[PDB]
Amino acid sequence: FIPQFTEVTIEYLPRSDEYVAYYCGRRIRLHVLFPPAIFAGTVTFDSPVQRLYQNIFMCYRTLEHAKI
């Protein structure tokens, strides 16, 4: 089974680094492929979309700015 995103969540513990899935209150199995960069202030994911992320948000900002 693969779920959607909007009602399940995923948890990472930095201390003794593992990852914990959750859906209806249980830890479910998981598979790392692209492990994210956890800095002390934020976590960014090595992903195709987050390699574009703030450029897409910049384009959104200037488009709403243009309509403003």
Next chain:
Amino acid sequence: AIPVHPTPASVRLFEILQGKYAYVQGQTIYANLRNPGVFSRQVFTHLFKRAISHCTYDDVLHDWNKFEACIQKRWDSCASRFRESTFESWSTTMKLTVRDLLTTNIYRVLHSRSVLSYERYVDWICATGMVPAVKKPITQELHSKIKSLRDRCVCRELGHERTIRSIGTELYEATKEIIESLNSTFIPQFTEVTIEYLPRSDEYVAYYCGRRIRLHVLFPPAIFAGTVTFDSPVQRLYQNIFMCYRTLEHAKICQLLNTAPLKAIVGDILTGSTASAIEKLFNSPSASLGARVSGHNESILNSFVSQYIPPSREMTKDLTELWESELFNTFKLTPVVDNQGQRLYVRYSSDTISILLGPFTYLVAELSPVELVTDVYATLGIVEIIDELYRSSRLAIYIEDLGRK
């Protein structure tokens, strides 16, 4: 002792691995060489080569003899061309019967969990020219994922071919020798480990979990008396990337500061009913702009207006092909293109596997008996390289030896 990893300038360099500060179209090709899979192709054709090498000629000639003994009880002068045709079909199903079982077992052993990641490798060498070589002693996964009968369940058929009964077992134990070497090794992430260099009696010391771990210099970084610079593809573009980031945020700053339609000096929003959307921002203070002099006695003689657009997308566009030229040059990437093709098939070269997986598979990964590959070993289909290996294999040359009787 002077730090290498967790310095602010070095982690500013390590950020461009991801896209957090600046990103252009040319940086899309950076993940293209960051694609793993060329490493799987490496070990994939290597252990096919290891399987096809240890075969003997005497195991297959009496196999063809017993194959003819099978067909004589099922089926004189016409039997000459009958035996030629049934040997031709026997060669075709020989290629088939090696290909099917081999691609099952090898895609099974290959796509299990491997803690070694080429994805985790290629980002380091282009960032710093340094690799953290970690030897994780936990190696109890291979007997758990694939122990026995995976080579035996698929081959239990009528025709007891001793060729597969000799070679599948030898490759099956051989895969346990090769997956061991790769999952025993480890390349980590960057945001939690560190690398350290000392000036006096200079060595480079890798540190994760409080211990000196192995490592290899690949591109010797320049440590000046005030700063450290890494001979790296990314830091060769470093302040041009940061200058483009600066002028882009500068451009949006001036764009966001000149939004008033009129300049005075003192002496749900995205979609809605446009009539009310007029009202919801006309009362807003975004419309007005009255600039100020600090001193009230301080007076102004004259005033001028100049909105200014800095060439933002012009500064992005040339830095795209800046990235393109640099990652075509220091990593040999030949774009396989059509007539006026816009860079449709970006592929590894001959020498760029010698400069990426050349050091990788032999220095930071301790894979001794593996080889590098060709252009068409990596270009062609991953099952279409199997029969191409077969086209220059020891067994099929023995079969083409049998090709003339």
Next chain:
Amino acid sequence: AIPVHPTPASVRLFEILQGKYAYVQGQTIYANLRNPGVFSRQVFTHLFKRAISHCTYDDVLHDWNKFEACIQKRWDSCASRFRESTFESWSTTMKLTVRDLLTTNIYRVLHSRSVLSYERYVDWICATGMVPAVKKPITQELHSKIKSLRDRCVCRELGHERTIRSIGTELYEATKEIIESLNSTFIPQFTEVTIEYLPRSDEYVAYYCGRRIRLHVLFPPAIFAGTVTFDSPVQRLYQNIFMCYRTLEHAKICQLLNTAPLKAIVGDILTGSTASAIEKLFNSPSASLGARVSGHNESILNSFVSQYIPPSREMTKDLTELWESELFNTFKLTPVVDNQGQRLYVRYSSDTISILLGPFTYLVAELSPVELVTDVYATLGIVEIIDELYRSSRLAIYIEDLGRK
């Protein structure tokens, strides 16, 4: 005594090896000739030649004789073309069974830790025309990294081929003489060592940890009474690169200085809610600009406005092809291109290996018996040069001598 290395102008010159001050698309091609691996091609095909030469014709002819003795117990008038075909397949597996042996062993000895690097050489010659030749006496790593049986356990098989049992040992011990010569030598970095010139009774002095080291002039510098100039590729561009850097930082200065939309004379930001983003910088003092007259009695008769954009990207664009022409010319680089190709395959030439690896492998490296390569020795694949060497190799001409019986 006059300094050469640690002077401020020459370390400004040594910086542009890396990307710290100015960088354009033309300087991407600098890493392409900075790529090592062509040096591995050098020692690769040289030890190939040292392997393939030391055969005897008498070894392979009786090897074919015993090979026929093997096949007569396994398999009359048809035996004529049978013996022709089995010799053809025997030549094919002869190429195969030398090739897999050499491909393992020579990639194994090839990708060792080599403290000599082409990367540390090519930057030094193009910077100043001078290389420091260091003879570092520790040479104990070869016996530890490779001792015995790496040439043997791969060939421990049924057919005791005396061709590999004669030639693999000699190529094995030959690598022990060749990797010794390269790892005995040393080319250093720049940021810790220095080069020094005495004008009086002129020689050049090298230094690392207080000793005069060996060294080799290649492009003799111009030593004037005020400064030193080096006949080099990068110092032939030096103040043009600095001029482009100066006008680019000046361009950013004027761009940052004319950001105000309105000119008075006295007398989180990257992404956010744009309605609040207006508010966060309109109150900021970046918006206003009131220009100053120094004297309060000093009055102003007339006042002007002129924003000015200097041609920044224009100054980058011609200097790109400035770098391209210089690194196409003083290092002979022939771009293998397609019809209207955008410089897709930038490759070493015939004569540029004689001007770079020519002096390298023979003057600072004391690799005496090694040879240079062809165009198609460096162009073609590192496994596809094996069979091309085989197409003109003494063993395979002896097999083509056997090609007619």
